[PDB]
Amino acid sequence: GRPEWIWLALGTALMGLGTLYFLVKGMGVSDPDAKKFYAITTLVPAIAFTMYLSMLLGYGLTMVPFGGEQNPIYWARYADWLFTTPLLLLDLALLVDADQGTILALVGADGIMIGTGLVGALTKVYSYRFVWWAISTAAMLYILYVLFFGPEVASTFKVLRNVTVVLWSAYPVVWLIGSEGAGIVPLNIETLLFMVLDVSAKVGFGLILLRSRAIFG
Amino acid sequence: GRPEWIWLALGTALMGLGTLYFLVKGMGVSDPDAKKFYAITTLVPAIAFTMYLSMLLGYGLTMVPFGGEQNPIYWARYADWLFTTPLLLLDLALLVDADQGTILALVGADGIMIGTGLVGALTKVYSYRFVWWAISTAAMLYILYVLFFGPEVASTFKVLRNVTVVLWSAYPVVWLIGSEGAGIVPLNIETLLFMVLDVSAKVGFGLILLRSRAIFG
Amino acid sequence: GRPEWIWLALGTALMGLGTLYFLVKGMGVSDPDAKKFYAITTLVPAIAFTMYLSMLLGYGLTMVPFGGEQNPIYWARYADWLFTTPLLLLDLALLVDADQGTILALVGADGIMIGTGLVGALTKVYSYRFVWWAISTAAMLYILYVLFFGPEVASTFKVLRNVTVVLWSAYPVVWLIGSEGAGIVPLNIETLLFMVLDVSAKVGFGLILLRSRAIFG
Numbered sequence: 001g002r003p004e005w006i007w008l009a010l011g012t013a014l015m016g017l018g019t020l021y022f023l024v025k026g027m028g029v030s031d032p033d034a035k036k037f038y039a040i041t042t043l044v045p046a047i048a049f050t051m052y053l054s055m056l057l058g059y060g061l062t063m064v065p066f067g068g069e070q071n072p073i074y075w076a077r078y079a080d081w082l083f084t085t086p087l088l089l090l091d092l093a094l095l096v097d098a099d100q101g102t103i104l105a106l107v108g109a110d111g112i113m114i115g116t117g118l119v120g121a122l123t124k125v126y127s128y129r130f131v132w133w134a135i136s137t138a139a140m141l142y143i144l145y146v147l148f149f150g151p152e153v154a155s156t157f158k159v160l161r162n163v164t165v166v167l168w169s170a171y172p173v174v175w176l177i178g179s180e181g182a183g184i185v186p187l188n189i190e191t192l193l194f195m196v197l198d199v200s201a202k203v204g205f206g207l208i209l210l211r212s213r214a215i216f217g
Numbered sequence: 218g219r220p221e222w223i224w225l226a227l228g229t230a231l232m233g234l235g236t237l238y239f240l241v242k243g244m245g246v247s248d249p250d251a252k253k254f255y256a257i258t259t260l261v262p263a264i265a266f267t268m269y270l271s272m273l274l275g276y277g278l279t280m281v282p283f284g285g286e287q288n289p290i291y292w293a294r295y296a297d298w299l300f301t302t303p304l305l306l307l308d309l310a311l312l313v314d315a316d317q318g319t320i321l322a323l324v325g326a327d328g329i330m331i332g333t334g335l336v337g338a339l340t341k342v343y344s345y346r347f348v349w350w351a352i353s354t355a356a357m358l359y360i361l362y363v364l365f366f367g368p369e370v371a372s373t374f375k376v377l378r379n380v381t382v383v384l385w386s387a388y389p390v391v392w393l394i395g396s397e398g399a400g401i402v403p404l405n406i407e408t409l410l411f412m413v414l415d416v417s418a419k420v421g422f423g424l425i426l427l428r429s430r431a432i433f434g
Numbered sequence: 435g436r437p438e439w440i441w442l443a444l445g446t447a448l449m450g451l452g453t454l455y456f457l458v459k460g461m462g463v464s465d466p467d468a469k470k471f472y473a474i475t476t477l478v479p480a481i482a483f484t485m486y487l488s489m490l491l492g493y494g495l496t497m498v499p500f501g502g503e504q505n506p507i508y509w510a511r512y513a514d515w516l517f518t519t520p521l522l523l524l525d526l527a528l529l530v531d532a533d534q535g536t537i538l539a540l541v542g543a544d545g546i547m548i549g550t551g552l553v554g555a556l557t558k559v560y561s562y563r564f565v566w567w568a569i570s571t572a573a574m575l576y577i578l579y580v581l582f583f584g585p586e587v588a589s590t591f592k593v594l595r596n597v598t599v600v601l602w603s604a605y606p607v608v609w610l611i612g613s614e615g616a617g618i619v620p621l622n623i624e625t626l627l628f629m630v631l632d633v634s635a636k637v638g639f640g641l642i643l644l645r646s647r648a649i650f651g
């Protein structure tokens with residue numbers, strides 16, 4: 001029905017498989033630290049899976065009036081990211097044994113990032129949408145700042161940090177030019193971009209982490 | 218007005234009394250571990266109380282169109298379970314000194330279980346409701362799996378585990394045959410079943426736990 | 435447009451500045467304990483800032499029918515308080531090294547306090563609104579009870595405790611006489627009162643705490 005459906009179906013499938021793979025891979029792990037990383041990393045795509053399914057079936061989709069039109073907004077993404085983005089930061093923070101003050105800063109900022117993103121997404125005054133985008137972006141930049149200025153461990157963290165910064169930074173650009181923002185890129189193509197980003201930031205990120213010896217004490 | 222009102226009133230009352238009883242019972246406890254179990258166990262029915270009240274007054278009730286009808290759906294249950302089910306798992310996990318990786322797995326899975334349950338409850342495409350029910354059930358079965366394959370302590374945990382598995386497993390069956398699912402059992406009877414299950418899984422479970430010497434260090 | 439706009443604008447500004455001040459002030463802190471207090475205390479007004487902005491732009495405002503009228507209800511306050519009030523309790527609890535059982539009690543009770551407040555705010559049956567207000571108030575009184583009956587540290591905690599009790603206690607009175615309750619005080623004046631309370635309980639509270647040597651190990 002909706003041209004973006006194929007990407008949602010493929011997104012659902014790839015999150016589903018990634019979840020199952022990490023579930024299997026994690027069986028037999030007894031190391032307490034390793035358990036933590038498997039739990040976090042498996043839960044990410046499991047949640048993403050349910051929200052991709054939500055969007056595919058049309059449950060995670062609403063219409064937001066602005067700019068003199070009914071704009072199709074997939075709210076289910078913010079429900080996803082609200083839980084998955086903090087968990088991904090938690091993998092990075094636990095990897096470097098970050099202290100609780102820094103964890104709370106990252107989680108807090110993340111919560112704000114997604115929350116303002118959501119408000120932006122559903123705002124009916126076109127111009128205001130972008131005020132929310134700017135605040136959320138500030139919060140993202142704060143997160144990237146902490147990650148950078150807040151041997152196997154070092155090495156794996158550096159790789160996952162670089163992966164994070166490049167992928168996460170693309171989301172505000174996609175949002176801004178997409179159907180939630182300027183509407184210069186059509187929803188179908190926006191949906192494809194977000195699937196590639198999400199699968200890379202969840203399953204891609206997850207394969208790198210769970211194959212490393214850093215997760216083990 | 219609504220025939221199920223009596224069960225909601227009785228549910229409200231019994232959660233209310235259970236909360237007060239556990240509040241009193243917990244006064245004077247100085248043991249740090251015991252405090253944790255009293256806090257968790259008292260908070261469960263306190264939350265359940267407010268949501269039963271919500272449903273009784275009609276605040277926690279919405280109409281969901283599907284199958285060519287306006288179906289009365291008490292959404293307030295998912296608001297309740299979203300917080301109470303994780304807390305009940307937290308009692309069990311703390312009882313056996315489970316590690317944080319296992320706690321996060323259980324909490325995560327629980328969140329998914331209830332979240333998908335909620336989406337199912339509010340889904341307007343009849344057939345899709347059951348896709349959500351199946352996912353949520355998978356998550357429940359994962360939880361039951363971890364509880365089983367993930368002396369006073371051992372003994373009390375075994376009793377509370379068995380209580381949990383039997384009561385929790387009935388919820389998907391009640392949902393499936395109830396007004397949220399197949400609609401072969403009328404809402405009034407469905408409401409009665411859920412009250413008996415909820416009071417047994419919260420106050421019943423809570424009496425067993427708070428009377429045990431396992432809670433003490 | 436709305437006469438209360440000036441207070442929302444001023445509220446937004448003052449939370450914004452407080453956030454920036456605490457962000458700057460916190461740079462260079464290396465002490466793990468101090469980090470925790472800076473993270474918590476900076477995040478409070480940051481969240482408050484976004485919700486004040488929400489209300490100013492009109493996003494955090496809905497109309498609730500009751501008493502034969504369309505009543506303008508700023509729901510964005512409960513979204514704010516839901517996260518900021520627990521964080522403020524967390525500052526106090528960490529200050530006195532409270533145990534996890536007490537933290538969970540305070541957080542739990544807080545969650546209930548705000549949650550019932552929200553339900554009250556949006557309830558369409560006028561008389562029921564006040565049942566919810568009474569429950570939420572009970573939860574508040576429980577919180578105040580725990581704070582009181584549950585040298586620099588002692589001294590700073592006593593000052594912040596006294597600040598908390600006096601400011602927090604005014605909220606139910608403002609709600610009750612305001613546009614959410616009895617409607618004897620007009621929304622503009624209610625909005626002013628809440629701004630003064632919020633800025634005092636967040637920035638005021640935050641200046642006292644972050645200037646103390648108690649935050650340091």
Ligand SMILES: *C/C=C(C)/C=C/C=C(C)/C=C/C1=C(C)CCCC1(C)C
Pocket residue numbers: 081084085088113114116117118120132133134136137138140168169171172175198201202
């Ligand atoms: C699995 C999903 C991931 C890792 C998603 C990350 C999402 C972001 C970093 C989104 C950022 C946004 C902004 C900074 C501006 C406002 C719009 C958002 C929410 C797309």
Ligand SMILES: *C/C=C(C)/C=C/C=C(C)/C=C/C1=C(C)CCCC1(C)C
Pocket residue numbers: 298301302305330331333334335337349350351353354355357385386388389392415418419
């Ligand atoms: C106090 C409440 C308790 C212990 C409730 C537990 C609820 C469940 C285990 C519900 C499970 C469900 C499924 C597995 C399938 C989908 C429908 C649900 C949410 C009823």
Ligand SMILES: *C/C=C(C)/C=C/C=C(C)/C=C/C1=C(C)CCCC1(C)C
Pocket residue numbers: 515518519522547548550551552554566567568570571572574602603605606609632635636
């Ligand atoms: C930054 C905000 C703060 C510290 C707000 C605290 C809010 C309260 C203590 C609100 C309490 C309420 C009641 C006890 C009764 C019901 C209405 C409420 C939610 C206003």
